[PDB]
Amino acid sequence: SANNPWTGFQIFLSPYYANEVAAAAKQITDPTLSSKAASVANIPTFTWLDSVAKIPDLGTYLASASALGKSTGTKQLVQIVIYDLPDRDCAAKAVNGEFSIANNGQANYENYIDQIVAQIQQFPDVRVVAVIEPDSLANLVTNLNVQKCANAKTTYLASVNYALTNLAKVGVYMYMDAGHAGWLGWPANLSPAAQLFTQVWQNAGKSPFIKGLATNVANYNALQAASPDPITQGNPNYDEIHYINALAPLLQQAGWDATFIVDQGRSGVQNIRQQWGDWCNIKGAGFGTRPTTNTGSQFIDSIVWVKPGGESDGTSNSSSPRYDSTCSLPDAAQPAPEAGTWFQAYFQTLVSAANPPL
């Protein structure tokens, strides 16, 4: 499209990820690996607003970005993930997330959005790009047979709508999460997916700030695969570019000339999964293509690092109340700590296996 949110801006680098990476490079013993590892703090990632407790961090990042822009003669851009739906991750094996539908989820999520909007409103010289609710809408395409998802459907739709509608009022550029090629890219899932995303776009008033969709968030697919990963058998859309090429024209026909962003933060190593649906701490993953607007596709505004590689996807300890058995599969790195916390051994391999190399 004409207006790529990233062009003409400097991305604000997460100080939280930078601090994690610096501490990790010190725990890495080999000096050559260590310098490459240390350089990861300079690679832009998304900040996950996975709880209300993270909202004050957003405020500090906006204010820091505003001051940095003035100090360096740049316009700054802060990258966030909206990730706090009630009954979050409905098809997962474990309950996570602070809000529940049965305890005023909708009002509490709305208040979470209101607190985010109230921060963003105070810093109009900082641009914000938000990924909207990974692992939400995609479940409403393929997983309505999952009872938790069926029962969450109206709440997910209403809550995502509230986020889109109100973040648009403060000019946030938004990409709704849209799964990945092995979820919604199956040809038979494309039309149902397009129908859902276009209904969501319509309900939020077709705001031009709703730029499109984010794919491969927290996943491992290639953007452009050299050859199909064996996990993809049966699906001609074996990588993200095939998925996006197939989905984009369906959205265009609805009057939404959508554009896309694609997570590649853990895509450096292909052919590492037994089954395509295995998502948790996949062993042998490497850092992938670094964020860039040089995407190779008319539909793709940016390659991004949404999931911050090195932070766990979930614990492998079956005694944890947060335990999802996907995190104990043969292709999951074990033992693994709680979701969101630092997983040092996993980070070190991401560095060693990076492709292109660091």
What are the sequence ranges of the domains in the chain?
A: 10-352
What span, in angstroms and rounded, lies between the C-alpha atoms of 181 and 171? 29
Beta strands in the chain (DSSP E): 10-11, 47-49, 76-82, 127-132, 173-177, 210-215, 259-263, 300-304
Q: Is 171 left (phi over 0), alpha (psi -120 to 50) or beta?
A: left
Kindly list the catalytic residues. 89, 135, 313
| Bond preceding residue 356 cis, omega within 30 of 0 | yes
243 φ/ψ angles, rounded to the nearest 5 degrees: -60, -50
Pairing of strands 259-263, 300-304: parallel
Q: Is 311 annotated as a binding residue?
A: yes
What span, in angstroms and rounded, lies between the C-alpha atoms of 310 and 143? 29
* SS3 label, residue 188: helix
Q: Is 50 annotated as a binding residue?
A: yes
Supply the DSSP symbol for 334: S
Q: Is 48 annotated as a binding residue?
A: yes
- Scored b (16 or more CB within 10 A) or e, 88-125 reads bbbebebebbbbebeeebbebbbebbeebbebbeebee
Among 217, 146, 223, residue whose Cα is nearest residue 178: 217
Looking at the DSSP assignment, which residues form a beta bridge with residue 259? 212
Among 128, 124, 126, residue whose Cα is nearest residue 163: 128
Resolution of this entry in Å? 1.0
What span, in angstroms and rounded, lies between the C-alpha atoms of 171 and 135? 24
What span, in angstroms and rounded, lies between the C-alpha atoms of 175 and 293? 15
Q: Is 180 annotated as a binding residue?
A: yes
Q: Which overall architecture, per CATH, does domain 10-352 show?
A: Alpha-Beta Barrel (3.20)
* SS3 label, residue 41: helix
- For residue 2, count CB atoms less than 10 angstroms from its CB and return exposed for 0-12, middle for 13-18, buried for 19 or more: exposed
Among 104, 165, 93, 154, residue whose Cα is nearest residue 130: 165
What span, in angstroms and rounded, lies between the C-alpha atoms of 62 and 77? 9
Q: Is 279 annotated as a binding residue?
A: yes
> Solved how?
X-ray
Supply the DSSP symbol for 130: E
Angle between helices 15-27 and 344-352 (to 10 degrees): 80
Measured CA to CA in angstroms, residue 134 lies from 54, 131, 184, 249, 345 at distances of 17, 7, 13, 22, 25
What span, in angstroms and rounded, lies between the C-alpha atoms of 351 and 358? 7
Q: Could you tell me how many residues make up the chain?
A: 358
Tokens 């709440």 locate to 155
Among 308, 198, 317, 216, residue whose Cα is nearest residue 255: 198
